[PDB]
Amino acid sequence: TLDQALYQVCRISNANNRMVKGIRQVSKKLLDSNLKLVLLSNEIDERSANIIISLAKKTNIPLIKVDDSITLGRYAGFEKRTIEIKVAKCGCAGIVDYVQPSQGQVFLMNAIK
Amino acid sequence: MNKQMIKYNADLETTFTVERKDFGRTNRRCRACFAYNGVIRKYDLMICRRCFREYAGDIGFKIYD
Amino acid sequence: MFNPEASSIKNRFVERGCYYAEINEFLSKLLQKEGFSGLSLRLHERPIRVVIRLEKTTEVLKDNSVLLKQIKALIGKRLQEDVSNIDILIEMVKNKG
Amino acid sequence: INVELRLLCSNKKLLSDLSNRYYNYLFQNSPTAKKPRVLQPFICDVTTRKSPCGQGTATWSKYKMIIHGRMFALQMTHQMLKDSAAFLQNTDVEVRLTLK
Amino acid sequence: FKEFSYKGVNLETLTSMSISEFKELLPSKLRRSINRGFSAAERDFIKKCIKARSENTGLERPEQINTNTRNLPILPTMIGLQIGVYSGRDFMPMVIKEEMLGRRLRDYVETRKLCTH
Amino acid sequence: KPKQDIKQIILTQFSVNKDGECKPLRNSCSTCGPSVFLGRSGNKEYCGRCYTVAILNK
Amino acid sequence: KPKQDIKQIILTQFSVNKDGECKPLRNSCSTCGPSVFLGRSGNKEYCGRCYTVAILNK
Amino acid sequence: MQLSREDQVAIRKYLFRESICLVKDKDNGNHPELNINNKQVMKFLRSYVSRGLVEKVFVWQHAYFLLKSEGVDVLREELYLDETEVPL
Ligand SMILES: [Zn+2]
Ligand SMILES: [Zn+2]
Ligand SMILES: [Zn+2]
Numbered sequence: 001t002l003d004q005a006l007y008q009v010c011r012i013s014n015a016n017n018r019m020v021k022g023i024r025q026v027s028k029k030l031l032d033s034n035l036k037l038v039l040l041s042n043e044i045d046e047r048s049a050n051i052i053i054s055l056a057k058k059t060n061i062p063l064i065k066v067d068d069s070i071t072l073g074r075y076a077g078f079e080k081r082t083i084e085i086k087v088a089k090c091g092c093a094g095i096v097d098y099v100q101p102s103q104g105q106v107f108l109m110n111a112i113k
Numbered sequence: 114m115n116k117q118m119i120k121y122n123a124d125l126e127t128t129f130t131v132e133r134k135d136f137g138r139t140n141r142r143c144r145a146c147f148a149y150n151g152v153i154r155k156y157d158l159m160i161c162r163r164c165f166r167e168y169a170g171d172i173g174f175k176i177y178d
Numbered sequence: 179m180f181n182p183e184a185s186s187i188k189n190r191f192v193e194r195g196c197y198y199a200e201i202n203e204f205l206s207k208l209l210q211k212e213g214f215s216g217l218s219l220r221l222h223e224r225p226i227r228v229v230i231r232l233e234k235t236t237e238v239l240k241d242n243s244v245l246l247k248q249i250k251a252l253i254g255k256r257l258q259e260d261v262s263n264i265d266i267l268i269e270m271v272k273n274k275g
Numbered sequence: 276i277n278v279e280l281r282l283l284c285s286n287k288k289l290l291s292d293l294s295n296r297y298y299n300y301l302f303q304n305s306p307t308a309k310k311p312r313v314l315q316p317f318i319c320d321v322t323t324r325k326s327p328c329g330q331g332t333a334t335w336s337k338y339k340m341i342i343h344g345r346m347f348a349l350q351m352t353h354q355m356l357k358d359s360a361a362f363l364q365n366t367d368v369e370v371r372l373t374l375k
Numbered sequence: 376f377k378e379f380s381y382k383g384v385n386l387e388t389l390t391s392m393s394i395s396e397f398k399e400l401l402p403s404k405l406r407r408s409i410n411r412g413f414s415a416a417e418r419d420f421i422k423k424c425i426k427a428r429s430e431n432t433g434l435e436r437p438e439q440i441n442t443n444t445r446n447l448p449i450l451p452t453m454i455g456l457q458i459g460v461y462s463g464r465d466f467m468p469m470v471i472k473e474e475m476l477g478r479r480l481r482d483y484v485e486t487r488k489l490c491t492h
Numbered sequence: 493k494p495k496q497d498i499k500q501i502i503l504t505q506f507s508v509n510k511d512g513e514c515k516p517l518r519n520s521c522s523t524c525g526p527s528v529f530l531g532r533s534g535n536k537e538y539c540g541r542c543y544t545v546a547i548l549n550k
Numbered sequence: 551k552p553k554q555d556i557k558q559i560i561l562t563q564f565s566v567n568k569d570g571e572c573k574p575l576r577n578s579c580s581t582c583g584p585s586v587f588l589g590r591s592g593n594k595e596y597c598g599r600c601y602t603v604a605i606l607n608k
Numbered sequence: 609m610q611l612s613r614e615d616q617v618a619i620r621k622y623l624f625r626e627s628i629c630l631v632k633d634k635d636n637g638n639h640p641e642l643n644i645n646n647k648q649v650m651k652f653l654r655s656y657v658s659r660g661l662v663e664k665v666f667v668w669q670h671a672y673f674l675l676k677s678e679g680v681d682v683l684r685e686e687l688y689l690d691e692t693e694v695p696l
Contacts, residue, residue, distance in 0.1 A: 015688030017613040024501070051503065054512065100690075120412035123394035125421050129412055144196075145668060153321060157189050162323045166336075171202075172195040173285055174321065174338035179315065187342060188319045191285060204667050222369055241677060247696065248628045252672055255630045495565035497575035504557045517555030531591045534601035538591025545594030547603055 002111055006066070008104025009037065009095060010075035018096040021076050023048065026092050030055040037108065038094040040065040041072050052092055062112045194221045201253065205230065208249075212237060215271045226259065228266045238268055277375055278356055280347045282311070284368040290343050293368050297347065300362065306350055314344035379473040386473060389451045397451060401477060405448040417444050424453040441466045445481040460484045505529055563587055609651040615644050619652050620687050623662075624680075627695040629653060629673040633666075 013019040020029055029035045030052075038056050040049065040063070056063040066072050069089040073079065078088040098105050116133045138149045145164040152161050160168070202217050213233020220227045232238065238245050246266055254261040282297075284290040294311050302308040320339040351359070356374075363370045379386045382400045389397070398409045413421070420442045431437040441459040449471060459466030460480050467484045475483065507517045518529040524541045531538045538545040565575045576587040582599045589596045596603040611619075622642060623629055631639065631653065635646040642649065653673050656662040661679035665672045675683070680695065 012688050015617075015686070017617060048501075054508075054514075058512070058514065119415055121415070121418045122412050123398060123409050125394070125413060125418050131412075153323070155321060156192055156319055158192065163327050165321070165323060166325075168199055169338050171199045172192060172340075174340045176336055176338055177341075178337070181317070184317050187283065188317060188340075191340075191342065200668055204665065204672065207665050207667065220365075220367075222367075223364060244627060244695070248674060251626055251628045251696075252630060255628075256670070495573070495575055497562035497565060499557065499562045504555050507553055507555065517553060531589075533589035533591065533594075533596040533603075534598065535603040536589070536591060536594040536596040538594050543592030543608075545592040545603070545605065547594075547605070550601070 002108060003071075005104035005107045005111075006039075006075055008102045009098075009108060010093075011077070012100060012102060013095045013098070014077055016099045018099055019076070019093060020096065021078075021090055021093050023052065023092045026052065026094055027055065029094060029096075030059045030061075033059055033061075034096060035059070035094045036061055036097075037112075038063050039072055039075070039092060041069040041091055042067060043069050044091060062109075064108075064112075197221060197257065201256070204252070205249075209238075213271070213274075221257075224259075224263045226253070226257070226264045228253065228264065229269055230266065231269045231271050233271055233274060235268060235270055276350055276352075278347075278349050278351055279373040280349065280363075281344060281371040281373075282347075282368050283342060283344045283371065285340060285342050286367065287341075287343055289367055290345060293366060294345050294347075297362070300359075301347075301349070304355075309347075309349075311345040311347050314346060316344070317342040381473075381476045386451075386454075389476075390454065392451065394450060401448060405477070405479070408446065408448065414444070416442075417447055420444050420447070421450070421452065424450075424456060427456055428452065428454075439466075439468060442480070445484075446479055448477075448479050449475045451476065462486055609648065609655070611644070611648050611652060615648070616652070617687075618642055618644065619649065620683060623653075623656075623673075623675060624683050624687055624689070624693075624695055627675045627680075631671045631673065633669055633671055 010019055020026060020035070026035075026038060030038070038052070038061070040052055042065075044052075053063070066075075069091055070087050072090040072093060073087040076090040076093055078090055079085050080088065115135065117130050118133060119128055120131055121128055141152055141154065141159060142149060143152055143161040143164060144159045145168070146161060148161045148163075150161070151163065152159060153165055158165070198217070198219050198221075201219060205217060206214055208214075209230075209232065212235070215231040215233065217231070218227070218229035246268070250261060250264050250266055253259075253266075254264055282290060282294060284293075298308070298310065318339055318341050320337060322335060322337045325334045325336055381389060384392075384400065394409065398406055401409070420440070423440050427437045427440065437456065439457045439459050441461070443461040445460065453471050454473060455471065457468060457470050458480075459468050460483070461467075462484050463486050469483055505516055505518060506514050508514050516529055518531065519537070520526045521528040521530055521539050521542075524539060528540050535548045535550065536545050537548070563574055563576060564572050566572050574587055576589065577595070578584045579586040579588055579597050579600075582597060586598050593606045593608065594603050595606070619642065629649075631650050632646055633650065637646055638644065639646055639649050650671060653662060653664075653671075656679075657664045657673070659679075659682075661676060661682055663674040663676060665674070675695070684691075684693065
C-alpha cells in the first residue's frame with residue numbers, strides 16, 4: 001500500500017534536512033521550483049486548496065493528497081509520547097531530494113506515472 | 114586574535130584603521146590551570162611555578178646542583 | 179659560544195615531553211579500570227609508536243577492539259597527525275607484584 | 276666522501292651506548308676508524324621558589340635539563356651511507372646528517 | 376583691555392581654525408594624541424559640539440553634552456558649552472571657558488575625594 | 493519597543509488571469525532583483541533591501 | 551490603467567495586550583485626526599487625506 | 609543551543625563516521641574538521657552526554673567525547689542509516 005511508501009519517503013527525507021513543513025514554505029519552494037510529491041490534506045479551506053493546487057500545477061511537478069492532516073502529521077514526524085503516542089497535525093508538505101534510494105520512492109513514482 | 118580599531122583624523126571625516134598589540138596577562142594563561150600569575154614564559158613554556166614543579170620530572174628537568 | 183640551533187632543539191624536546199604528560203593523564207583517566215601501568219611514545223620518527231602497559235585486556239580487545247581505534251583517533255587528533263601514521267601495541271604487564 | 280653525523284640526546288647512558296655501538300661498527304668495517312667528538316652540552320635552566328604561598332623561609336630550587344651531543348665525521352662511499360642509514364632508527368637519540 | 380589669547384592667537388581666529396591648524400599650538404603629548412587620530416566615540420562628541428554651537432540662538436542655554444572621552448584635549452569648538460565629564464561614578468558638569476585650552480578634560484575633574492582625617 | 497502587526501497569509505503580491513497565468517500586482521525593483529516588490533502610500537513608493545523611497549511629483 | 555492589489559481583511563492596523571486592550575500598531579496623523587494611521591517604507595513615512603510623505607534622516 | 613538544522617546533521621554524521629570527538633573549551637574559534645563554532649559543538653554534545661549516549665573526559669584544555677556502544681543504534685535511528693552501517 002502507498003501509505004507505507006510515503007512513510008519510507010518521509011522518514012529518510014527528514015533525517016537529512018530535505019522535508020519541508022507548512023503551506024508558506026511549500027509556496028516559496030513551488031515558486032523556487034526545487035521540490036517533489038507535494039502532499040495536500042483534507043480539512044483546508046477551498047481558497048487555500050486553490051492556492052496549492054494552482055501553484056503545484058504551474059510548477060509542473062507531481063501532486064498528491066492524504067485522507068487527513070493527522071495522517072500527514074505522522075509522516076512529518078510531529079508525533080510525541082502521551083505516557084502510548086499522539087500525533088500533532090500538519091497541513092501541507094513536500095520533499096527536496098531523495099538522499100538514498102528506496103522501494104517506496106519507486107512505487108510512488110509509478111503511482112504518479 | 115589581532116583585533117582592529119577605527120580612528121578619525123583631525124578633520125573628524127577621514128578614517129583609518131590601527132591594530133591592537135597583544136600584550137599583558139590576557140593571553141598568557143597557564144596551559145595546565147588557566148592561572149594569570151607566576152607564569153614561567155622561558156623556553157616557550159607557558160606554565161605557572163606551582164604546576165611546573167609537579168610536571169618538571171615528566172618534562173625532563175632535574176636538580177643536579 | 180653561540181648556536182642558532184640550540185633554541186630550536188630545546189623547544190622541540192620540551193614540546194614532546196608536554197604531549198607525553200597530557201596523553202598519560204588521558205589514558206590514566208580512561209583506563210584506571212584496566213590497571214594502566216605505563217606508556218611509551220616515540221614522537222621523533224613516523225610512524226608514531228605507542229606501547230600501552232595494562233593489567234587486564236578484555237575491554238580494550240572487546241567488540242573488534244574499537245577502543246583501540248578510538249584511542250588512535252584521539253591521539254591523532256590531539257597531535258594533529260594522520261591516523262595512518264600511528265601504531266598502538268597493548269602489553270600485558272608481567273610480574274605485577 | 277665525507278659525512279658528519281650528529282647524535283643528540285638528553286640522556287647520557289643511551290648516547291654512550293649508541294656511540295660505542297656505532298664506533299664498534301666503524302672499526303669492524305675498518306675505514307680508518309676514530310672516536311666521536313664530545314660536544315659542549317646545551318643546558319636550559321629555571322629557578323623558582325618552593326612554597327605555593329608566601330609563608331616560611333623563602334627557599335629556591337634550580338632545575339636544569341642537559342642535552343648531550345656527539346659528532347662523528349667520517350669517510351664513506353654513497354652506497355655505504357645509504358645502507359648504513361638503516362642503523363639510524365628506533366632510538367631515543369635524535370639523529371641528523373650533513374654532506375658535501 | 377585686550378582680547379583673550381592662546382599662544383599668540385586671538386579667540387576670533389582660534390574659533391575659526393581647523394583641528395589640524397590648532398595642533399601646531401598645543402603641547403607635545405596633546406599633539407601626539409591628535410596625530411594618532413580620533414576614536415569613534417570622540418568623533419561623535421565633537422560633531423555634537425559643532426552641531427550645538429551652530430543650533431543655539433537667543434538667550435536660552437543649549438542642553439548638556441555627556442562624555443567618557445576623558446583624555447581628549449579641549450578644542451576651540453566647545454567654548455561656552457556645558458559638558459558633563461564622567462568621573463568613574465557620575466557626569467560632573469563644567470563650562471568650557473577660554474582659559475582651559477592646552478589641557479585635557481581629565482585635568483578639571485577629580486576621580487577621588489580630598490582627604491581630611 | 494513597539495508591537496508588530498501581521499497580515500496573515502501573503503497572497504496580495506500577485507494577480508491571476510482567466511487563463512490561470514500569474515503576474516505581480518505591485519511593481520518590482522530594478523536594482524534589488526525583480527523578485528523584490530515595491531510598496532505604495534500617498535506620494536511614496538518604497539523598497540526592502542535598500543530602504544529607498546521614491547517621492548512622486550503629484 | 552494599472553491593476554489594484556488587495557490585502558483582504560484589514561486587521562494589521564492594531565495590536566492586542568494580554569488584558570484584551572487594543573492599540574494601533576502603525577503611528578497616527580497629528581493633522582488628519584488620530585483615526586488616520588501612517589505608513590512606513592525605507593526613509594518614508596506617509597499619510598492618506600493629505601498625501602504628505604515625511605523623509606527620515608537615517 | 610543556537611545551531612541550524614544543517615549544522616546539527618553535520619555533527620551527527622561526524623560522530624557516527626568516527627566514534628570520537630575532541631573539543632577545545634573557552635574558545636570562539638571554528639572546529640577544524642566541521643567549520644562550526646567550538647562553544648556550539650560543546651553545547652550540542654553536552655545533550656548526548658546528558659542522554660547517556662556519550663562519555664566525556666576533561667583533560668587540561670580539551671574535552672574528549674567517546675560514543676558508547678549503547679547509543680550507536682540511537683544515532684543510527686536518528687540519522688536513519690541502513691542497518692549494515694557501522695563506525696570506522
Ligand atoms: Zn598552573
Ligand atoms: Zn531596491
Ligand atoms: Zn495627514
